[PDB]
C-alpha cells in the first residue's frame, strides 16, 4: 500500500 | 541535471544460432527521463519492440529495458540506438555475444 502526500507540499 | 545513459545489449539466454531468444537493450544511469530507444536488425528498425521497467533507482538516475524476439544467426547484425539530450548524437551499440 502506497504513501500519501496528505496535501503537505514543498 | 543531465546524466549520460549507459547501454548494454545482450540476449536473455546464452546465444545459439538456430535457437530462438530474446535480445535486450538495457539503458541506465540517465537523466532526464526522456529517452528514445530503437532496436535495429541489419540497420533496419525492428518493429515489435517492448519497453519496460520505466523507473529509477536509489541514486535517482533512471533506466529502462527494451527487448524483442530473435534468432541469432551467423550473418545477422543487431544493435540498439539511444537518443538522449545528454549527448549530441544518438549512440548505436552493436550486440557482442560473448562480451
Amino acid at each position: 500500500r502506497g504513501p500519501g502526500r496528505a496535501f503537505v507540499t514543498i | 541535471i543531465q546524466k549520460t545513459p549507459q547501454i548494454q545489449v545482450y540476449s536473455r539466454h546464452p546465444p545459439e544460432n538456430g535457437k530462438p531468444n530474446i535480445l535486450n537493450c538495457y539503458v541506465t544511469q540517465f537523466h532526464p527521463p526522456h529517452i528514445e530507444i530503437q532496436m535495429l536488425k541489419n540497420g533496419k528498425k525492428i518493429p515489435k519492440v517492448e519497453m519496460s521497467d520505466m523507473s529509477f533507482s536509489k541514486d535517482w538516475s533512471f533506466y529502462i529495458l527494451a527487448h524483442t524476439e530473435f534468432t541469432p544467426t551467423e550473418t545477422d547484425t543487431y544493435a540498439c540506438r539511444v537518443k538522449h539530450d545528454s549527448m549530441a548524437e544518438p549512440k548505436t551499440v552493436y550486440w557482442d555475444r560473448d562480451m
Binding site: P3, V8, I10 | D98
Partner: protein, 274 residues
C-alpha cells in the same frame, strides 16, 4: 534476511506539452507489482505482478484515489520549486519521491524511507530517526522549515512503521512462490586472447535472483580491483539477473587467478578458475 516495499514516484513538468506527467511504481524487493500512469487511457493503479491481482475492488480504487491525490500535490510542488530556484517556466523539470520500508527477518522495521530529489539531485530526506529532515541547498531548508513546523514526520513515520510493514507482510506472504525464491547464479569463466599478447578472463554469473551478488578476482589470495572491470547487474527480462567481471592477465599465468561468487542462493561462495 530482510525485505522491502518501496514506492517510486515521478512528476515531470512539460510547459510545451501540457500538465505534468505523473507516475507511481510499487516494488517488493526487485519485483515491480503496481503502476500508475497519468498519460494512460484511463489512469488507475494497475497490477504488474499476478500475486497482487488477488486484491479487491476497494484496493484498486483506494490506490487510484491516493495516486490522484498525490499528483495534485506534485503539480503544486513543481511550481513552488520554480519559485525557489528562480527558473523559467518553459523548461521541463522533475520531482522524484521514493518512500518505503525495509523490514528484518524478525518482522521488525529495519529502516523507513521518505525522500525527494528535484531535477535528479537530492532535495529533502527523512533521516533514519524518522523525526528530522536533511536538506542540501537553502531552498529545501525552506521546505524543511515549512514541514518541520507542521509535524509532517509523525504521519510519515506512522506510515513507514505501520501500514508499510503490514502490507509488506501481507505481500510477502501472498507472493511467496516468486518473492520467496532464491535462484543461485550459474557461473563460468571465458578466455579472451587479446591482440596485445595478454588474456582477458571473464567471470560470468547468470540466472540469479535476487539481483544482489558479489563477483571478485584474486591472485594467490589478493583482491585485484585495479585490474578488474565489472558490468552493472542487468535483467534477463524473465525475473532473473546477469553480471560479469573481467581481469587482464599475462598469458600463461591464468591458473593463478580466481573468480569468487557470493550470492544468497549459494550454499557456499563459489571459486572459479579457467
Amino acid at each position: 534476511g530482510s525485505h522491502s516495499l518501496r514506492y517510486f514516484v515521478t512528476a515531470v513538468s512539460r510547459p510545451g506539452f501540457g500538465e505534468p506527467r505523473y507516475m507511481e511504481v510499487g516494488y517488493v524487493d526487485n519485483t515491480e507489482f503496481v503502476r500508475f500512469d497519468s498519460d494512460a487511457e484511463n489512469p488507475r493503479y494497475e497490477p504488474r505482478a499476478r500475486w497482487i491481482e488477488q486484491e479487491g475492488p476497494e484496493y484498486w480504487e483506494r490506490e487510484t484515489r491516493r495516486a490522484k491525490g498525490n499528483e495534485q500535490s506534485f503539480r503544486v510542488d513543481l511550481r513552488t520549486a520554480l519559485r525557489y530556484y528562480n527558473q523559467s517556466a518553459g523548461g521541463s523539470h522533475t520531482l522524484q519521491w521514493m518512500a518505503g520500508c525495509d523490514v528484518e527477518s524478525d518482522g521488525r522495521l529495519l529502516r523507513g524511507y521518505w525522500q525527494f530529489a528535484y531535477d535528479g539531485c537530492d532535495y529533502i530526506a527523512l533521516n533514519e530517526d524518522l523525526k528530522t529532515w536533511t536538506a542540501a541547498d537553502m531552498a529545501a531548508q525552506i521546505t524543511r522549515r515549512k514541514w518541520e513546523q507542521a509535524g509532517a514526520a509523525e504521519r510519515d513515520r506512522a506510515y513507514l512503521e505501520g501500514e508499510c510493514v503490514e502490507w509488506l507482510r501481507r505481500y510477502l506472504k501472498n507472493g511467496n512462490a516468486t518473492l520467496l525464491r532464491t535462484d543461485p547464479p550459474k557461473a563460468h569463466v571465458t578466455h579472451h586472447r587479446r591482440p596485445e599478447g595478454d588474456v582477458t578472463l571473464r567471470c560470468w554469473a547468470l540466472g540469479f535472483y535476487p539481483a544482489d551478488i558479489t563477483l571478485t578476482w584474486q591472485l594467490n589470495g589478493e583482491e585485484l580491483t585495479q585490474e578488474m572491470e565489472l558490468v552493472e547487474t542487468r535483467p534477463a527480462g524473465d525475473g532473473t539477473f546477469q553480471k560479469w567481471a573481467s581481469v587482464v592477465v599475462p598469458l600463461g599465468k591464468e591458473q593463478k587467478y580466481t573468480c569468487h561468487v557470493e550470492h544468497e542462493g549459494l550454499p557456499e561462495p563459489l571459486t572459479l578458475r579457467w
